[PDB]
Amino acid sequence: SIFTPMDWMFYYFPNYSRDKVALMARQIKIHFAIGFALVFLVYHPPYKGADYGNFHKSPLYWYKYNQLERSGQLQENLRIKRDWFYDEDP
Amino acid sequence: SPEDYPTPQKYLEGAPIPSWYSFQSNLVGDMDLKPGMARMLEVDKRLTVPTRTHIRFLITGADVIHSWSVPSLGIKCDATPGRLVKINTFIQREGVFYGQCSELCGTLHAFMPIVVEAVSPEAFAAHAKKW
């Protein structure tokens, strides 16, 4: 069980927890497999994860995007504020 | 075959192949310091580099382990014998960035500073052409 208070595991799943020694072994094995899987399934996979046209845009992204789009803030935010180095001295 | 040794066409047509220049950078001694020089950090030959350019620094150590550190450029690479470590940098502003060896290297570990001056690309080209 991941991020689980084991007091809860003991209460709600009494039969699965009856053998506490075996329960401890599963705890180790489950988290061992999780760590192993992360390396070879999240980090290792070659030539993957480079689809930057598919950046996830969550429901909160759109709420805030539409709010600014409705007003002029989105246009103003994206506008380039300065594209010159020196001001002109009068 | 000649083609197993790839060479750009310009050089095959007689263009001069570039040479390399080496110089030694030494600490300025206490008795040789000038009124405005920074003690423990000045050197007699600085390393000039162009700004707004991607530069590859290859760092190694000949005899013992030194460490080339330039805090302003965010570089701290160990100059270890047998390892030619690649460090990439992109300077954004002109100036002179001072650093010191960061690996105990013997008696004068505290007396081999690292001075890098970043100048405009037009200035760097003129400097390199003359020096």
Binding site: Y43 | A38, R39, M40, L41, D63, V64, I65, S67, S69, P71, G74, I75, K76, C77, D78, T80, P81, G82, R83, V85, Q100, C101, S102, E103, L104, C105, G106, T107, L108, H109, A110, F111
Partner: protein, 459 residues
């Protein structure tokens, strides 16, 4: 007799006595360093004798780690109370216990004699080659001392492990602390011996491991494979002491005893697999760096659990009991101080932050807050708790609020400014520096002289 005694409690006293003696030499070296660093210029070391400074910093580190704090927290308090905590008559291996302390003294004499007779040069306490292998005979003498010290450490570790076979009571948390340190020694020392032998081979047998086509980074792997387990071999006994003091003085049973024990076991396993956070700037592969950075940050979890379990021990304790005893103050001060040292450790654990902060005085302040403040105070607190049992007198420490306050204030004056100069930046293992770093260096130096003066008031 004096030298022939096998009594485990007498030998424990010998370890504390010798740690204080050797400690005088350690503190003196520290005063030399801070005096020199008071301003820019030469103050007490000539520019032609800069090799002496390199030797001072090297010996300071080696002596304080292997001849003072380790003999004090792993040899002194352990040999005196462990057989009592185990409700056993005496230590399992009486004759081995005697030779261990004699070995420590003999290796100390070799080191100090090498100062007097050999040319004085230094290569750091980490003895990095090729610098260590191109030096003079003083390096050879120091190697002999370390190997001899290693013999004493391993046999003492064997001695403590045998308590499991004879313990007649319950393995208390403190006993668990020593056993795990013993395991860490049994697994780490043999690797250290091998790499030290290779340093000798290149120094004395014309070997070529640390010359071109041989990787000098190899030494750093094997050294630090022992190096970092060493820092936990030095802290874990301190943790064991803190647990006893808080429970006893607050009259509160240890909370989460099994979590305390399992936290100590966890720290050991993790501490045995994170060594390369000392080698971040060499140029290791990206995946290696990420592994070591990830596992290094994990060590905070078990270490954090112990800290919070200590806090609840002090919470809720009876108000009528006087809380100004020096042992209690030191135990509480350890929690406050260790958190500072550990948090800064997590900061340096991020490798990108480490690029800026490697070989700077920020690292110094980090391990001083844990060792020079935390470990020292823990050893003092432990001895103070056992004052009646040990029976020493002729000191004014047991109830001395002035000593605790002055020590805490002045020790922080020394090392807090060393965090600042780490972003200035002032490299480590240097004596001369730019004039714009004098202020902070001066403040720390004023702190060092003051702390020494406070050490005289105890008598």
């Amino acid at each position: 007799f004096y030298i022939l005694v096998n009594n485990n409690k007498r030998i424990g006293i010998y370890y504390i006595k010798l740690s204080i003696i050797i400690g005088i030499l350690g503190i003196v070296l520290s005063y030399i360093i801070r005096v020199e660093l008071y301003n820019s210029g030469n103050r007490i070391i000539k520019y032609d004798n800069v090799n002496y400074y390199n030797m001072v910093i090297t010996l300071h580190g080696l002596l304080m780690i292997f001849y003072i704090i380790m003999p004090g927290l792993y040899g002194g308090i352990p040999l005196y109370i462990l057989p009592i905590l185990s409700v056993i008559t005496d230590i399992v291996l009486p004759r081995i216990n005697n030779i261990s302390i004699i070995i420590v003294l003999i290796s100390y004499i070799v080191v100090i004699n090498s100062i007097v007779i050999e040319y004085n040069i230094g290569t750091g306490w980490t003895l990095y080659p090729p610098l260590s292998i191109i030096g003079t005979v003083i390096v050879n003498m120091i190697l002999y001392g370390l190997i001899i010290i290693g013999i004493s450490s391993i046999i003492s570790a064997i001695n403590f492990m045998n308590i499991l076979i004879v313990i007649d009571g319950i393995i208390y948390v403190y006993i668990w602390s020593i056993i795990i340190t013993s395991v860490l020694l049994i697994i780490s020392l043999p690797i250290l011996n091998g790499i030290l032998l290779m340093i000798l081979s290149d120094i004395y047998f014309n070997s070529i491991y640390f010359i071109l086509n041989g990787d000098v980074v190899l030494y750093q792997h094997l050294f630090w494979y022992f190096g970092h387990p060493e820092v936990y071999i030095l802290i874990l006994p301190a943790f064991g002491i803190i647990s006893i003091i808080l429970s006893v003085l607050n009259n509160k049973i240890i909370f989460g005893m099994k979590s305390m024990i399992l936290a100590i076991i966890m720290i050991s396993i993790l501490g045995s697999i994170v060594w390369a956070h000392h080698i971040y700037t060499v140029g290791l592969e990206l995946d290696t760096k990420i592994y070591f950075n990830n596992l290094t940050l994990i060590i905070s979890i078990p270490t954090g659990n112990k800290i919070y379990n200590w806090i609840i021990l002090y919470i809720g304790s009876y108000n009528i009991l006087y809380n100004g005893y020096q042992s209690l103050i030191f135990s509480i001060m350890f929690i406050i101080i260790f958190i500072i040292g550990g948090i800064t450790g997590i900061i340096i654990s991020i490798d990108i932050i480490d690029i800026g902060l490697h070989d700077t005085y920020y690292i110094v302040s980090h391990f001083h807050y844990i060792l020079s403040i935390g470990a020292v105070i823990s050893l003092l607190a432990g001895i103070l708790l056992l004052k009646d049992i040990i029976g020493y007198y002729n000191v004014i420490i047991k109830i001395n609020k002035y000593f605790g306050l002055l020590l805490f204030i002045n020790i922080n004056i020394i090392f807090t400014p060393q965090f600042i100069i780490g972003f200035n930046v002032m490299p480590r293992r240097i004596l001369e520096y730019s004039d714009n770093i004098i202020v902070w260096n001066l403040i720390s130096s004023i702190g060092s002289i003051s702390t020494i003066l406070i050490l005289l008031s105890i008598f």
